[PDB]
Symmetry: C3
Subunit: 372 residues, 3 copies
């Protein structure tokens, strides 16, 4: 009767967790390190590393319990503080629950890395730590519960395979609020290296979200290859048409645009949908950083816009008629789309409000703007 762990899924999921951690340490740190002024690199890398450590600790102390424990529509409980009452041999799905703790913790880490990396230039160090505590505890954790922890958005059938809302939109909005409150790249080879590490790690991010080494993991893997490639080509074509030539930063940005766009969709769509989502995301990203430029190192320009596009287009290309795996029983495309839009709107407002509270608390305690 009691579920038994499959060692193939244990192995797959521990390695996928390592790939996701790789996305933060050193992926996103190198990505931002090549974008910001050289004089701010060391401080940014320190803030990414220290806030990464903080997230790891908060996650085990109470974050996992409040995100994935049973509670209400908005948060879980505190019955798994420091993972108490989780037996070592406890199974979640087809893997040991300890591996689920680590895999889901690694997602919290990259989400925070996306914010801290972009704002470390301008925000005070003690203030970023305050902000991380506030926003992780009151925005990442409730939103993760609502989408992946059986809460409000899951109970309405929201489709988000690997975190278009939980990770990308959530962090993009936090970044924009930060930039609004706190008013050329020097090492593009480093930007490219970070981009590449983010790409390789993202296979653990997307495919690992199946929770098992099955055909859905395989689907998500292939769709991640295709969407990324198509968004690179889409971005680069739009750059050739708009600016006359492609650029390395454009190609890297296109890759990220496709990775973000396919994040919510990868486990639900066909390879034809992945190609279309990739092209659209690459072009919407290019448009986002162009026209929509309140954007610290273009957090929203890509993660926000492409996150929204992917979440919406997931409600389309999940349809069996378009090569997807099919909507749930009794769910039309029109209904699913409405659920995707509602989920996007809730994530935007929830993250913005918590982020405003986080930055304001930091500002009233220690001051936000980096000192003298």
């Amino acid at each position: 009767a009691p579920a038994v762990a499959d060692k193939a899924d244990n192995a797959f999921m521990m390695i996928c967790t390592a790939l996701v951690l790789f996305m933060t340490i050193p992926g996103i740190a190198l990505f931002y390190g090549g974008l910001i002024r050289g004089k701010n690199v060391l401080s940014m890398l320190t803030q990414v590393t220290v806030t990464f450590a903080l997230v790891c600790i908060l996650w085990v102390v109470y974050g996992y319990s409040l995100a994935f424990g049973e509670g209400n529509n908005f948060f879980g409980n505190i019955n798994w503080l420091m993972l108490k009452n989780i037996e070592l041999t406890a199974v979640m799905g087809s893997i040991y629950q300890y591996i689920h703790v680590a895999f889901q913790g690694s997602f919290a880490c990259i989400t925070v890395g996306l914010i801290v990396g972009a704002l470390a230039e301008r925000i005070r160090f003690s203030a970023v730590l305050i902000f991380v505590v506030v926003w992780l505890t009151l925005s990442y954790i409730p939103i993760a519960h609502m989408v992946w922890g059986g809460g409000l958005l899951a109970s309405h059938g929201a489709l988000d395979f690997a975190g278009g809302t939980v990770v990308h939109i959530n962090a993009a909005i936090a970044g924009l609020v930060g930039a609004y409150l706190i008013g050329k790249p020097h090492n593009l080879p480093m930007v490219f290296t970070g981009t590449a590490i983010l790409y390789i790690g993202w296979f653990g991010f997307n495919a690992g979200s199946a929770g098992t080494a099955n055909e859905i993991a395989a689907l998500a893997f292939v769709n991640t290859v295709v969407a990324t490639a198509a968004a690179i080509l889409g971005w680069i074509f739009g750059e050739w048409a708009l600016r006359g030539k492609p650029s390395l930063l454009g190609a890297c940005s296109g890759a990220i645009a496709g990775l973000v766009g396919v994040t919510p969709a990868c486990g639900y769509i066909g390879v034809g949908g992945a190609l279309i989502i990739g092209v659209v995301a690459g072009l919407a990203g290019l448009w986002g950083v162009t026209m929509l430029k309140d954007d610290p190192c273009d957090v929203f320009g890509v993660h926000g816009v492409c996150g929204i596009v992917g979440c919406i287009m997931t409600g389309i290309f999940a349809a069996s008629s378009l090569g997807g795996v099919g909507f749930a029983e009794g769910v039309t495309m029109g209904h699913q789309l409405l659920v995707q839009l509602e989920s996007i709107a809730i994530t935007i407002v929830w993250s913005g409000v918590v982020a405003f509270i986080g930055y304001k608390l930091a500002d009233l305690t220690v001051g936000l703007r980096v000192p003298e």
Copy 2:
């Protein structure tokens, strides 16, 4: 009756695919980035990234179908365009076929990365895209079909575990033709970093070519460690004897020489053969870049020479008497050697001719030499 996927092999093979993609993004890009003039790095990285995206797309659209579909001795068919008629739960060997699509696509990517990285300095950007289409479609795909897709060379019993011909010789010849038509490293730490990433990813390349996490994967893994180490020592000893001291570029080149040499052999030989092939490859590589120097960043000097040496020596050390896994029934060492040589010759001529056609078509459409 119908084959069932083993989740352990699914997991193994998806992670091996990620390791192979890692070899291109950022492996080979960093390798060449430290070798070429600083003023050409950004353009090379853009060309590697964009042509990588192009290969990914062409592979799914028609490349997989024409390489691994059933057809004739030279190419497959177009029954799997955009992977149509491949059910998601379809099994190939002991893994889902979708994972086979991705794994084999990643090999096409690194093969093209080897060419583009070396020639991006001198070739026009639109011309490289034309060349990639022509050469991928008419050289990589038919040669992959002939060797790994049940075509001409497979039907004669050619031994090539992970692509001495399909990947290394194929691309080396394309590189030389390019250099013939289009007539010191500045960041050796970057060269070393690329080399190291190529090394780690190559375990997915070599061991993943078993298609399963079995004793042949384990054999290929160990032989990859041994051959690489022995070629480093071989190259470095020859450099000490010839130039008076080892160098970092020598040590990295030796590593690549051993990785290339053991590619066709790793799943067929004993560890004693891997040591011998490594030493020979390291020394043949050193000789190749010395005496044979028409060599853009030494594509053939190592990949061509060591590819040929490895393919030949596979026909020797696969013998059971030498610790190998044994030739097929009824096959003597003399016969096997002849088959290896025939396979090498066909790959050289096929790739050269297609490459000449590719570069000439680009030259007549847009012009090959990078503009003003």
Copy 3:
């Protein structure tokens, strides 16, 4: 009757081996590369690469046989020279023995990389090769046999999951002897990149030491996340208190301190113990590099001190009452602690003496100090 390999464990363990190799190539090379004077980087990278190749070869020729073959309390035998008499399908635990050869060889590689990287600046190149042969054969191999090969320390019940003694203390002492005999960082972004690669690879190091993708691997994985995070925070808090501000080098050093401290403990302790060991290790590391500064690039300052702290605290937090997996039957905490201390003392003296012999033999043959 005969053991059968589990493909899930085969896959897990081959990938963990690749992650451990990643720690040396390029992990530890980049770590030291950013620490030492720019003018010595290329020579250090060459020495790390060439000695890495040497270790790989010695391991297969005789090192595996003498470390993990059956012999006496101090070394094995020479019945597995070049892995002869090891059938390809031979099983060790739940994986093919060939994979065990590679996994354990990768540990020898990182241990030597820790020494060579730190001393390459000052030691002659031919002398480091002599030293590596002597110390690998007479210190790493016997100590690995004593702890993990059924020898003296294993037979007394010493707890060392992933090599607090075999790897970290062993190499730290060899480093100090070297520095005693042979009397600011320029690229901190490179130090951070090396640190990050060491971190990701260390999951293969720690979790792979379970030999299987089971709940102990999962435990070791989570404890590695927690201990690393806590040591970062511990180090950084002590730096804030002592120096007034955190630094990037501090944050990276704290990470390494926690990784070292949890190495012997990760598979035996609860997550609460991992947090405590991480904090203590981070602070002991900070103290080590402060007060105890005979320290070439701070080998002992972190690997030695934190290795000792972790080995001792493993004898505490393995207790079931503290969340650990429990001491063996009939073993009190007091007895276990005494065994940990005895194991630490034997490793320190054994490594020091062999290291002195190694450096002296090199000095009498070729001379230790780098020439003119």
